[PDB]
Amino acid sequence: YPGDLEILDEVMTRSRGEFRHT
Amino acid sequence: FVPFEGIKNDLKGRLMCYKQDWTGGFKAGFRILAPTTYIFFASAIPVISFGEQLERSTDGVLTAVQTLASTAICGMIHSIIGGQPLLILGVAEPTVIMYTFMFNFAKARPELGRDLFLAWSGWVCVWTALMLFVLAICGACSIINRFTRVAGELFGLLIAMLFMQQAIKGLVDEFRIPERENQKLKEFLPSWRFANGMFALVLSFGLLLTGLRSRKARSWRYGTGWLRSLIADYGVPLMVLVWTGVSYIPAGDVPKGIPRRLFSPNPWSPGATVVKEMLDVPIVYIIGAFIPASMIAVLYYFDHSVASQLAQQKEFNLRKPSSYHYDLLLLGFLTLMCGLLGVPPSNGVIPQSPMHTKSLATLKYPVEVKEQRVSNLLQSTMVGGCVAAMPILKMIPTSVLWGYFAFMAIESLPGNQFWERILLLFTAPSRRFKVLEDYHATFVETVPFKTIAMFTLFQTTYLLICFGLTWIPIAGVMFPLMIMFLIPVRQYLLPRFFKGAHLQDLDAAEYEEAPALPFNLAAETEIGSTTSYPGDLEI
């Protein structure tokens, strides 16, 4: 299963670190 | 807006968790070093790049020594007595631009010259500190909820444009003779200059492409988990090291300065407070320093607050309170100190602060953040120690740093909804179903395309006007005012032209996303109602 940083990599924008709401 | 009320509440809240803020960091053991090293590398490389930019722009008065020293001292002080330790401080590009404007102004006036630039900058910093004190005391941080997306993303794209412009300027300059160098060296013959320029292109593009690729390592299917995480976390410094090593390959057969390496001097070499020179500045210019001081104060009031907000997103499930007012007050004090010491001021930086919070997070299978002061203190101390290691850092070719500038510009884009809307504006009308076939912003489905187009055209015109303003020799220092005016514009003018829910969708506080739709569902939509069928060669 994916690690914490692997998961957080997908839900946070790279430009500004904003959480994505889907 | 009761004076001192916000500061008092912040201090009362943060004084109840100080000792825990330290012991929790101590209780983490040696595992606190991984986030510390990650954030240290995220902080150091851009600050060195900005130091080189200043070295070029101030004729050597300010270099990477000063930017690193400012970052380190401000970070250490903020870690010890700051309100929100998750916030990372550093010298940023808007500060570099403002200082470049100030140096250009000072160099052209006989009364100031290059010998009083740092004294006049000290006065500018004094004015800025006073303005930030007033803003913090009067509770101006209560209205930071009005710093909406329209301003933040426009500012981000403007900084991205400036980054790319700097990369281009540096790469162009690699082909020329530097201003303050012995022009008779073999390094500067036309043949060797052409060779240096082409080698710089190779190195910068290698750095950029490899660094961009490394960012997605955690989603690869090769290697081990720890190796993938290592690449994803330290790709940038690793690629900087790799391309430095590459640059040393032809060292045996080329002149000394091929390729060109960092221009910042070594502080250890015998050749090497501005208060004494501050009293030598004429009174007229002491008063006139109020003009750039207000713009710098506006910049810091915006950026510090936004960085802290990003670091404190509610999805992090943080348990300790915020300190916006007190942190603005401390930033004022730090700006005063930096001005008195002859270094540019530091402020909260993006995306370093949210990335710090993320690096401190774990999922309890549900985000839990280890909030303490040790990580910030240690990373600031390491940034300070980079000053002693300047001889090692002087081995980095400048082209690698120009590539890093391009990297920062391109990395400004991925989560920027303004950039997404520009790309959508350039999309062929019959190919928008392709936009609906992947993850996309919700306004793409909930807002008519005409409204999106008008909103984007207005924003793009504003951005281009600001970028052009930065090119005007003297008035360019007013661009933070252009940024600030977007707040009242959004609050009062936009509602007249745009309708309610559409403005809310296009300027949402949270990042709203929708999953990919099936083709049969991407065709019923208004935006995807003009689906042209593919050709034979497309099949």
Asked whether residue B62 is assigned to any structural domain, the reply reads yes
Please name the residue of chain A whose CA is at the shortest distance from the CA of residue B307.
A16
| Cα within 13 Å of Cα(B119), Cβ side | 18
Name the DSSP class of B441: E
Instruction: Say if residue B399 is in the same domain as residue B434.
Output: no
Instruction: List, edge to edge, every strand of the sheet that includes A20-21.
Output: A20-21, B511-514, B440-441
**Which residue in A9, A15, A22 is closest to B156 by CB distance?**
A15
Task: Assess contact for B85 and B371: CB atoms under 8 A.
Answer: yes
For helices A4-11 and B352-359, angle between their N-to-C axes, nearest 10 degrees: 150
Mark yes or no for CB contact A16/B439 under 8 Å: no
Q: How far is B114 from chain A (nearest CA, A)?
A: 37
**Pair B57, B123 in one domain:** yes
Q: Which amino acid is at B398?
A: T
Q: Show residues of chain B in contact with A13, CB under 8 Å.
A: 414-415, 511
Quick check: B200 and B398 in contact, CB under 8 A?
Answer: yes
Specify the experimental method: cryo-EM
Q: Is B426 part of the contact surface with chain A (CB cutoff 8 Å)?
A: no
Gap from A3 CA to chain B (nearest CA, Å): 9
Q: Torsion angle of alpha carbons B253, B257, B258, B260, nearest 10°?
A: 160
Residue B369 backbone dihedrals phi, psi, to 5 degrees: -110, 130
Cβ count near B100 (within 10 Å)? 19
Closest CA to B354 of B82, B26, B39, B90: B39
B439 with B292, same domain: the answer is no
DSSP state for residue B322 in the 8-state scheme: -
Q: Which residue has the tokens 């959480």?
A: A19
Evaluate whether B327 touches B87 at the Cβ level (below 8 Å): yes
Q: How many CB atoms lie within 10 A of CB B37?
A: 18
Beta bridge partner(s), residue B363:
B367
For residue B380, give its domain range: 5-147+259-411
Examine the domain organization and report whether B480 and B451 are in the same domain. Answer: yes
DSSP, residue by residue, B84-102:
-TT--EE--HHHHHHHHHH
Asked if B144 and B324 touch (Cβ cutoff 8 Å), the reply is: yes
Give the position of tokens 């391309």.
B243
Q: Do B358 and A21 count as a contact with CB atoms less than 8 A apart?
A: no
Note the Cα B36 to chain centre separation in Å.
Answer: 19
Cβ–Cβ below 8 Å for A19 and B510: yes
How far apart are the C-alpha atoms of B483 and B487, rounded to whole Å? 8
Q: Is residue B450 in some structural domain?
A: yes
Count of residues for chain B?
A: 539
Query: Which residue on chain A is closest to B512 by alpha carbon?
Result: A21
Same domain, B353 and B494: no
Helix (H, G, I), strand (E, B) or coil at B397: strand
Q: What is the phi-psi region of residue B59: left when phi exceeds 0, alpha when psi lies from -120 to 50, beta otherwise?
A: left
C-alpha distances (whole Å) from B366 to each of B218, B353, B513, B518 are 20, 20, 20, 31
CA angle B105, B106, B107 (to 5 degrees): 95
Q: Do B354 and B497 belong together in one domain? A: no
Distance CA B511, CA B375 (A): 28
| Interface touch A9/B351, C-beta < 8 Å | no
Assess whether B14 and B113 both reside in one domain: yes
Asked if residue B240 is part of any domain, the answer here is no
Residue B199: inside a domain: no
Number of domains chain B is built from: 2
Contact B489, B481 (CB under 8 A): no
Same domain, B139 and B267: yes
Closest C-alpha among B379, B511, B417 to residue B68: B379
